[PDB]
Design a protein around this ligand. Structure first.
Ligand code: MG
Ligand code: MG
Ligand code: MG
Ligand code: MG
Ligand code: MG
Ligand code: MG
Ligand code: MG
Ligand code: MG
Ligand code: MG
Ligand code: MG
Ligand code: MG
Ligand code: MG
Ligand code: MG
Ligand code: ZN
Lengths: 216, 53, 120, 122, 114
RNA sequence: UUGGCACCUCGAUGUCGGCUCAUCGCAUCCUGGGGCUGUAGUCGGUCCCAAGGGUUGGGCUGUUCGCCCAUUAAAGCGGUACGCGAGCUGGGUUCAGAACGUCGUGAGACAGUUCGGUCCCUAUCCGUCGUGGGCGUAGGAAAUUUGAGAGGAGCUGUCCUUAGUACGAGAGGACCGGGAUGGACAUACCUCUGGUGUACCAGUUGUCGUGCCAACGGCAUAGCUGGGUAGCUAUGUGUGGACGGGAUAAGUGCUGAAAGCAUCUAAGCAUGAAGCCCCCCUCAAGAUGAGAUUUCCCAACUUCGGUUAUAAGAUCCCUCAAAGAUGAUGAGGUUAAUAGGUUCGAGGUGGAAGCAUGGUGACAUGUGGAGCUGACGAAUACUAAUCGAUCGAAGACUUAAU
């Protein structure tokens, strides 16, 4: 079981051995370091905490997340590492295989590895029931005054209320999503890029977490 | 459509908890010492960033 | 880009009027949103002036309004001529940043953020 | 993308000229058919003296579509028209001649006789 | 350019053996076709009606009339499936996309050689 | 269901069907597990367990029904004010017009028919879907988290092989097991195929301007037309319901007496479903039971009660977008690439203007893949993120241990 953190760059295509067009997503997974190792003894569970992407060192009057705060700088320093923008825990990996301050390389994954990619999906803002919940529209003509409305939200005196889980307009997207059983097409060590077959959630520049597929 | 019951003074006033205006984001102008809006030209002396506007 | 609460034709027309006015006066008081849009339009006009070629003059003529500026000498110069003369000459050695916006604060009528946009 | 009520030209000498799609076979709620899919159809226009008559309910295989098909290599083939061939239960054509080009996807479907008869397989 | 990482990873995919062509040109595309076990080259000859995209994602569309039926083949430019491309003729056209040809036939559909 | 009764409602509880959105029961339509069979096999019949998921499109009719066409694994039956009109429709029915048949002397009338015929409402409360602020969580903070709980998902076809084997006179033709590939559905995403693309490029009509020519601008749906970037998108591209574990149902037993036999049950011990609890995905410590880990901050005053601004930190304000109704979130704020500009590209368009040349001319060709170009890549402090201000600890008691 392996895990790495990367940023989504975009999509492209690669030609397979038989000349099949393979839709791919380019992920850059440079600057991964094991910040901390969590153990059952101390934390009650085993995990490695990986910090990805170096951030600038602490300064006195930092006004942004670009510069590490004193708490963050200390945590990273314990691992003898530079402060990191993104930090995530991998429970799947074996703690013994890793040492604190160790670099996690893209070469950990190899071509043909089946992986699960986790990321936050693209935000869509306030969205109606048709787009958010894939509901059918009402008639567009024939006297209709019902087009993009959600429909009846209940029954009558029996229940005299709307049940929890009724599908209504609200904020859509910006949700954690895991796409399972994706494949590593290629690993570029020089550019620190992993090529994942298919597409993964979130905008370009978004954080992606790549893990060995849970289902095998 | 219409209110079934009148709103009590208590309920109305609870609703008005967040109905308020904040103090303007103002700082003392360095040149004249009168308060000015931050990132705005000082109206009193007509100076911004140590230069007359 | 900003819609500025106008339709496409109205938006384009107002931006031409604003750009020409800024070129003539060299400083104008307007709303922040309009100023933020106009800075792009004017600077692209300055770019054309700095190139100075006939094609650039014709490209600038598409945007600039036909107005007459009365000089102290009493000579009359069109906005296009001022752009391709004095304004272009001033900013020859400067690369971008031909305008600045200074916030003035809200106005009484609608609370709109008044700003001054000026060349330099 | 052929659906219910789609009219297709018939690319054969079976005696049917135009058919209308009664059904797309291959599952409940199945909406569309493309090249290689079998459809149930009624004959709307028939050439006189042909074997197949107007108003006959028959089965046909789709040979060309405007939608076209995408191949695994990322290549596409699209046709100017939507065409079908009236077929027997064995998948053999009712008519003796196939008219116009057919997609190679018919070979996958095991419509070998049609593929053989077709002037060009692309 | 495009994102530099995308260009770096897909640079190997690009083919440098391909000839230069424009929409309106007549191309003889030699396509590697597998029928059962057997593999052979089948030539599709037609006018290029469209070229779009960039890098490894670039595609082109060739149009031919077969037995009175228009057929369009869209190909990825850098697909290994194309053995070779030959430019038979260079055509005079006034636009990048020749969609108007789809509704034309015979003399109306003719394109003048450069 | 048709009724009976007349108990809430006549200072109004809108009524058929459809549409939208569902939700529940199981007397189960399909799929899963069984028993018996007048069960050879393949198919069936009947009964038991089982509600996890699934349960199509048309013709006719206002229809509900129902019949029919074509499918499907199946086209389940019921409740929810015959669910749902402050969500929609308004064809039927149930106003005023008119007509037919019929009845009436007549005015008129008819669960007979025919044609036509106004569906209002800015959401207060609960409820529901989203999204913030306060305080708490015995110091003040930054990150990473455990998961009590809760939600989601849960469906199936066909084909190949085992095997023309079992079975069977033949016809026909298994199980069990192993593969492959679909339908429907869900979800993420725009590389591809397409859609849109009102500050992209080009062609073109009428008319009015920039004095005229040339070149341009206004108006005509964006005047119209052909393309089209980013973004947003489906019909496009990936992925999923896998493999399993534990306990069970109807069942099937092993051992076994009461009851010397027998007996699956009483003691004891196994096996056994798409179902149950997990496994998978998502939320989640206001889980007031407020959890854990790592790191940061740690002083003076004092009436000795405690206070104080400051620390770490975080905001105001400002430049913004991957975020967004607003908040919020995230990228930045000069010790700076946050945006604009500028410069260089990608993609798009398709050959600018000017000049020259050929033609009587409309035009053509060359200069020259030209010129132009929103959102995309990179670089560059030229412009703007100024100067500032505000908030924010000093850690209660008891007991035990050390
Ligand atoms: Mg609909
Ligand atoms: Mg409407
Ligand atoms: Mg009584
Ligand atoms: Mg009342
Ligand atoms: Mg039962
Ligand atoms: Mg009802
Ligand atoms: Mg109602
Ligand atoms: Mg009516
Ligand atoms: Mg009556
Ligand atoms: Mg794109
Ligand atoms: Mg005009
Ligand atoms: Mg003219
Ligand atoms: Mg007018
Ligand atoms: Zn001042």
């Amino acid at each position: 079981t392996k895990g790495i953190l990367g940023r989504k760059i975009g999509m492209t295509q690669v030609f397979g051995e038989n000349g099949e067009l393979i839709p791919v997503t380019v992920v850059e997974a440079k600057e991964n370091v094991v910040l901390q190792k969590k153990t059952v003894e101390v934390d009650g569970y085993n995990a490695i905490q990986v910090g990805f992407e170096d951030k600038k060192a602490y300064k006195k009057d930092a006004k942004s997340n670009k510069y590490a705060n004193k708490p963050a700088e200390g945590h990273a320093k314990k691992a003898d590492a530079a402060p990191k923008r993104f930090i995530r825990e991998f429970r799947n990996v074996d703690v013994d295989a890793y040492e604190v301050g160790q670099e996690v390389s893209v070469d950990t994954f190899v071509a043909g590895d089946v992986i699960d990619v986790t990321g936050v999906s693209k935000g869509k803002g306030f969205q109606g029931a048709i787009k958010r919940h894939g509901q059918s529209r009402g008639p567009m003509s024939h006297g209709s005054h019902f087009h993009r409305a959600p429909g009846s939200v209940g029954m009558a005196s029996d229940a005299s209320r709307v049940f929890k889980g009724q599908k209504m307009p609200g904020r859509m997207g910006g949700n954690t999503v895991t796409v399972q059983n994706l494949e590593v097409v290629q690993v570029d060590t020089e550019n620190k890029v992993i090529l994942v077959k298919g597409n993964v959630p979130g905008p370009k520049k978004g954080l992606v977490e790549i893990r060995t597929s849970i289902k095998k | 459509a219409v209110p079934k019951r009148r709103t009590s003074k208590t309920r109305k006033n609870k609703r008005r908890t967040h109905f308020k205006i904040s103090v303007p984001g103002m700082t003392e102008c360095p040149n004249c010492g009168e308060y000015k809006l931050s990132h705005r030209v000082c109206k009193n002396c007509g100076s911004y960033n140590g230069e007359e506007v | 880009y900003r819609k500025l609460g106008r339709t496409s034709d109205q938006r384009k027309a107002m931006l031409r009027d604003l750009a020409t006015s800024l070129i003539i006066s060299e400083r104008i008081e307007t709303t922040e949103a309009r100023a933020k849009e106009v800075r792009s339009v004017v600077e692209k006009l300055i770019t054309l002036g700095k190139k100075g070629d006939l094609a650039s003059r014709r490209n600038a003529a598409k945007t600039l309004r036909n107005v007459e500026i009365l000089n102290e000498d009493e000579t009359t110069q069109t906005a296009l001529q001022k752009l391709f003369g004095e304004i272009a000459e001033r900013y020859t050695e400067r690369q971008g940043g031909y305008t600045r916006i200074l916030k003035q604060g809200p106005r009484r009528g609608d609370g709109a953020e008044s700003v001054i946009i000026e060349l330099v | 993308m052929i659906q219910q009520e789609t009219r297709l030209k018939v690319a054969d000498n079976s005696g049917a000229r135009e058919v209308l799609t009664i059904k797309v076979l291959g599952g409940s709620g199945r909406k569309t058919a493309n090249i290689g899919d079998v459809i149930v159809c009624t004959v709307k226009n028939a050439t006189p003296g042909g074997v197949v008559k107007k108003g006959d309910v028959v089965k046909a295989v789709i040979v060309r579509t405007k939608s076209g098909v995408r191949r695994n290599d990322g290549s596409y083939i699209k046709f100017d028209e939507n065409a079908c061939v009236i077929i027997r239960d064995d998948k053999g054509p009712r008519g003796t001649r196939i008219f116009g080009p057919v997609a190679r996807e018919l070979r996958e479907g095991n419509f070998m006789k049609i593929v053989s008869l077709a002037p060009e397989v692309l | 350019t495009n994102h530099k990482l995308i260009e770096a990873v897909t640079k190997s995919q690009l083919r440098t053996d391909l000839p230069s062509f424009r929409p309106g040109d007549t191309l003889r595309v030699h396509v590697r076709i597998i029928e059962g076990t057997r593999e052979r080259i089948q030539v599709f000859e037609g006018v290029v009606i469209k070229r779009r995209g960039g890098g490894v994602s670039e595609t082109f569309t060739v149009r031919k009339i077969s037995s009175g039926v228009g057929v369009e083949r869209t190909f990825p430019l850098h697909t290994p499936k194309i053995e070779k491309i030959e430019v038979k003729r260079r055509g005079k056209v006034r636009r990048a996309k020749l969609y108007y040809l789809r509704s034309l036939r015979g003399k109306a559909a003719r394109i003048q050689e450069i």
